[PDB]
Structure formats: C-alpha cells, structure tokens
Amino acid sequence: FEYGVTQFPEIVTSFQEVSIKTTRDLLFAYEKLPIINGISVVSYPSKQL
Amino acid sequence: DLTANLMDSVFIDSSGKKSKDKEQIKEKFRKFNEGFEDLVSKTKQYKLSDPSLKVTLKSEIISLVMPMYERFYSRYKDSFKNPRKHIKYTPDELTTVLNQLVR
C-alpha cells in the first residue's frame, strides 16, 4: 500500500509542532533556580492543556 | 554532600540494569537538582570580598562537582526521548550557573 508522499509530510509537520509545544508546556522546567522565584510551573495549564 | 550522595546514588544502583527504576533517574537527578539549588540558594547569603577568594571557592567547587556530572550525565543521558522532563541541566548550562554564581 503505497505511497502518495502527502501522507508523510503531514506526518512530520505536526510531530515537530508537538515537539515545540512540548517546548512551551514543559518549558518551565529548566530554569530553575532559587529563591525559588519559580515564575512558571513546569506542568502548568491544565485548562489550556 | 551533594556530590557525595550523588555518586553514592550511582554506586548503590550500579548493580542491575538500565533504569527501569525511573525512580532512580528522578532520584539521582531530581534530588541532585534539589540539593544543587539548595546549595546555590544558600550561596546567595554571602557575597565575597577578595577576588582571589571568588576564584578560589569558584574553581574549588567546580573541580569538586564537574567530572561526576560529566561521566554521570553522559552515562545516563540515554533514557527517554525527553530526558528534559526528568534531567534538567547540561554541563554547559550548569557551568554557566557556577560562572554567574560568582558575581
């Protein structure tokens, strides 16, 4: 069963966007110092998630 | 103490397999981050006066910490597609933290 590569391109351009939004949701882990003035929660917005 | 029980936490689970005990991943690496930011936190209480003491304590504690995290970070950076969600620092960025721990 093959092939029609417009399958494969849109198989990518969401997986990468999953990686970037992974790097905005999970963005607030690596900062991460004292006070802690931890100004953003590493697993924060369950509504917006 | 941080380096001590860090490499001891390497030692006690040096027996078996790769960390399917991911409580050991987040044990060593999370609690390493815990005690690390405790130490950076209580480093902030004191502000040095000799520049050569800044160089001294700086390069001393750099030479204390680093190779553990080099062989150990680099040993155990092969456990997830996002180790990010378990392991936080590079040696690059941790080095940078130490280099602006000493303003």
mmCIF file of C-alpha atoms in Angstrom:
data_model
loop_
_atom_site.group_PDB
_atom_site.id
_atom_site.type_symbol
_atom_site.label_atom_id
_atom_site.label_comp_id
_atom_site.label_asym_id
_atom_site.label_seq_id
_atom_site.Cartn_x
_atom_site.Cartn_y
_atom_site.Cartn_z
ATOM 1 C CA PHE A 1 0.000 0.000 0.000
ATOM 2 C CA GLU A 2 1.902 2.970 -1.351
ATOM 3 C CA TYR A 3 2.580 5.795 -1.323
ATOM 4 C CA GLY A 4 1.470 9.383 -2.001
ATOM 5 C CA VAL A 5 4.031 11.411 -0.006
ATOM 6 C CA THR A 6 1.493 13.997 1.249
ATOM 7 C CA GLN A 7 0.881 11.349 3.880
ATOM 8 C CA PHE A 8 4.475 11.589 5.037
ATOM 9 C CA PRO A 9 4.841 15.386 5.076
ATOM 10 C CA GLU A 10 1.818 15.933 7.280
ATOM 11 C CA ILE A 11 3.083 13.035 9.358
ATOM 12 C CA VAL A 12 6.017 15.314 10.159
ATOM 13 C CA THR A 13 4.727 18.883 10.473
ATOM 14 C CA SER A 14 2.530 18.041 13.440
ATOM 15 C CA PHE A 15 5.076 15.841 15.216
ATOM 16 C CA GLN A 16 7.509 18.745 15.171
ATOM 17 C CA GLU A 17 4.768 21.094 16.369
ATOM 18 C CA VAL A 18 4.205 18.557 19.121
ATOM 19 C CA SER A 19 7.897 18.997 19.897
ATOM 20 C CA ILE A 20 7.652 22.785 20.024
ATOM 21 C CA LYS A 21 4.508 22.863 22.126
ATOM 22 C CA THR A 22 6.281 20.298 24.259
ATOM 23 C CA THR A 23 8.768 23.138 24.467
ATOM 24 C CA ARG A 24 6.259 25.528 25.740
ATOM 25 C CA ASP A 25 4.281 23.352 28.138
ATOM 26 C CA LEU A 26 7.385 21.653 29.507
ATOM 27 C CA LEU A 27 9.330 24.903 29.013
ATOM 28 C CA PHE A 28 9.015 25.872 32.658
ATOM 29 C CA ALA A 29 11.131 23.037 33.984
ATOM 30 C CA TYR A 30 14.653 24.097 33.037
ATOM 31 C CA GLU A 31 15.338 27.472 34.521
ATOM 32 C CA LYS A 32 15.053 26.672 37.599
ATOM 33 C CA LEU A 33 16.947 28.398 40.356
ATOM 34 C CA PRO A 34 16.417 29.893 43.810
ATOM 35 C CA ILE A 35 14.659 31.780 45.534
ATOM 36 C CA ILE A 36 12.767 29.718 44.151
ATOM 37 C CA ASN A 37 11.326 32.604 42.245
ATOM 38 C CA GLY A 38 9.839 29.907 40.036
ATOM 39 C CA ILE A 39 7.823 32.244 37.847
ATOM 40 C CA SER A 40 6.279 29.494 35.699
ATOM 41 C CA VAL A 41 5.024 25.999 36.546
ATOM 42 C CA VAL A 42 6.709 23.146 34.675
ATOM 43 C CA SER A 43 3.413 21.301 34.022
ATOM 44 C CA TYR A 44 1.168 24.283 34.369
ATOM 45 C CA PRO A 45 -2.017 24.980 32.443
ATOM 46 C CA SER A 46 -4.417 22.016 32.668
ATOM 47 C CA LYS A 47 -7.225 24.177 31.310
ATOM 48 C CA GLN A 48 -5.039 25.364 28.439
ATOM 49 C CA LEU A 49 -3.596 21.862 28.094
ATOM 50 C CA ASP B 1 27.433 16.100 50.448
ATOM 51 C CA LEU B 2 25.697 16.716 47.098
ATOM 52 C CA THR B 3 28.497 15.125 45.090
ATOM 53 C CA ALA B 4 28.882 12.502 47.833
ATOM 54 C CA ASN B 5 25.394 11.035 47.781
ATOM 55 C CA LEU B 6 25.185 11.730 44.051
ATOM 56 C CA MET B 7 27.984 9.329 43.205
ATOM 57 C CA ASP B 8 26.808 7.107 46.053
ATOM 58 C CA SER B 9 23.457 7.095 44.275
ATOM 59 C CA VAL B 10 25.440 5.915 41.261
ATOM 60 C CA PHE B 11 27.047 3.287 43.497
ATOM 61 C CA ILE B 12 24.020 1.650 45.120
ATOM 62 C CA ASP B 13 22.248 1.135 41.774
ATOM 63 C CA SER B 14 25.428 0.125 39.960
ATOM 64 C CA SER B 15 24.246 -3.484 40.323
ATOM 65 C CA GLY B 16 21.454 -4.265 37.918
ATOM 66 C CA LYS B 17 20.065 -2.965 34.638
ATOM 67 C CA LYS B 18 19.362 0.316 32.894
ATOM 68 C CA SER B 19 16.971 2.423 34.956
ATOM 69 C CA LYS B 20 13.587 0.823 34.520
ATOM 70 C CA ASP B 21 13.579 2.006 38.120
ATOM 71 C CA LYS B 22 12.917 5.507 36.830
ATOM 72 C CA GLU B 23 12.611 6.495 40.472
ATOM 73 C CA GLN B 24 16.389 6.112 40.318
ATOM 74 C CA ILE B 25 16.557 8.504 37.342
ATOM 75 C CA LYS B 26 14.492 11.093 39.125
ATOM 76 C CA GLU B 27 16.037 10.092 42.450
ATOM 77 C CA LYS B 28 19.633 10.856 41.451
ATOM 78 C CA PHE B 29 18.829 13.602 39.006
ATOM 79 C CA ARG B 30 15.867 15.203 40.776
ATOM 80 C CA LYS B 31 17.399 15.124 44.253
ATOM 81 C CA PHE B 32 20.681 16.225 42.714
ATOM 82 C CA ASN B 33 18.806 19.244 41.367
ATOM 83 C CA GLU B 34 17.141 19.720 44.768
ATOM 84 C CA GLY B 35 20.385 19.809 46.709
ATOM 85 C CA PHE B 36 22.068 21.755 43.929
ATOM 86 C CA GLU B 37 19.572 24.585 44.128
ATOM 87 C CA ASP B 38 19.684 24.394 47.918
ATOM 88 C CA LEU B 39 23.416 25.000 47.693
ATOM 89 C CA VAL B 40 23.030 27.794 45.156
ATOM 90 C CA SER B 41 20.302 29.236 47.373
ATOM 91 C CA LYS B 42 22.480 29.359 50.461
ATOM 92 C CA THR B 43 25.382 30.562 48.336
ATOM 93 C CA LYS B 44 23.394 33.771 47.841
ATOM 94 C CA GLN B 45 23.623 34.647 51.552
ATOM 95 C CA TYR B 46 27.300 35.507 51.294
ATOM 96 C CA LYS B 47 28.990 37.994 48.986
ATOM 97 C CA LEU B 48 32.744 37.730 48.846
ATOM 98 C CA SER B 49 35.328 40.460 49.137
ATOM 99 C CA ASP B 50 38.623 39.030 47.960
ATOM 100 C CA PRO B 51 38.539 38.430 44.198
ATOM 101 C CA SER B 52 41.032 35.605 44.698
ATOM 102 C CA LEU B 53 38.620 34.026 47.162
ATOM 103 C CA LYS B 54 35.989 34.236 44.431
ATOM 104 C CA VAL B 55 38.388 32.460 42.080
ATOM 105 C CA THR B 56 39.338 30.077 44.893
ATOM 106 C CA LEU B 57 35.905 28.911 46.067
ATOM 107 C CA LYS B 58 34.705 29.058 42.452
ATOM 108 C CA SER B 59 37.333 26.786 40.940
ATOM 109 C CA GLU B 60 37.436 24.566 44.030
ATOM 110 C CA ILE B 61 33.747 23.730 43.912
ATOM 111 C CA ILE B 62 33.796 23.488 40.097
ATOM 112 C CA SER B 63 36.591 20.933 40.428
ATOM 113 C CA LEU B 64 34.558 19.242 43.157
ATOM 114 C CA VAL B 65 31.387 18.816 41.156
ATOM 115 C CA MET B 66 32.042 18.613 37.425
ATOM 116 C CA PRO B 67 33.506 15.183 36.404
ATOM 117 C CA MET B 68 30.838 13.326 38.344
ATOM 118 C CA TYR B 69 28.187 15.055 36.267
ATOM 119 C CA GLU B 70 30.345 14.595 33.165
ATOM 120 C CA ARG B 71 30.621 10.801 33.289
ATOM 121 C CA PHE B 72 27.240 10.545 35.022
ATOM 122 C CA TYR B 73 25.168 12.951 32.977
ATOM 123 C CA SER B 74 26.839 11.470 29.909
ATOM 124 C CA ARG B 75 26.376 7.975 31.313
ATOM 125 C CA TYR B 76 22.648 8.341 31.904
ATOM 126 C CA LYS B 77 21.507 10.752 29.181
ATOM 127 C CA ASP B 78 20.052 7.817 27.212
ATOM 128 C CA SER B 79 16.798 7.054 28.990
ATOM 129 C CA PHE B 80 13.961 9.000 27.339
ATOM 130 C CA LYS B 81 13.074 10.898 24.235
ATOM 131 C CA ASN B 82 12.603 13.836 26.614
ATOM 132 C CA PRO B 83 15.123 13.414 29.419
ATOM 133 C CA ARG B 84 14.242 17.119 29.827
ATOM 134 C CA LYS B 85 11.192 16.034 31.804
ATOM 135 C CA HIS B 86 13.494 14.150 34.183
ATOM 136 C CA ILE B 87 17.002 15.621 33.824
ATOM 137 C CA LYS B 88 17.433 19.344 33.654
ATOM 138 C CA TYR B 89 20.934 20.713 33.137
ATOM 139 C CA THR B 90 23.779 20.346 30.708
ATOM 140 C CA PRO B 91 27.311 20.672 31.994
ATOM 141 C CA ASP B 92 27.368 23.735 29.746
ATOM 142 C CA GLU B 93 24.498 25.490 31.476
ATOM 143 C CA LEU B 94 25.445 24.212 34.929
ATOM 144 C CA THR B 95 28.943 25.553 34.314
ATOM 145 C CA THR B 96 27.311 28.859 33.332
ATOM 146 C CA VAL B 97 25.285 28.831 36.576
ATOM 147 C CA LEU B 98 28.523 28.416 38.519
ATOM 148 C CA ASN B 99 30.123 31.166 36.451
ATOM 149 C CA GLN B 100 27.340 33.527 37.466
ATOM 150 C CA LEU B 101 27.167 32.121 40.948
ATOM 151 C CA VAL B 102 30.292 34.234 41.461
ATOM 152 C CA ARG B 103 29.205 37.778 40.795
#
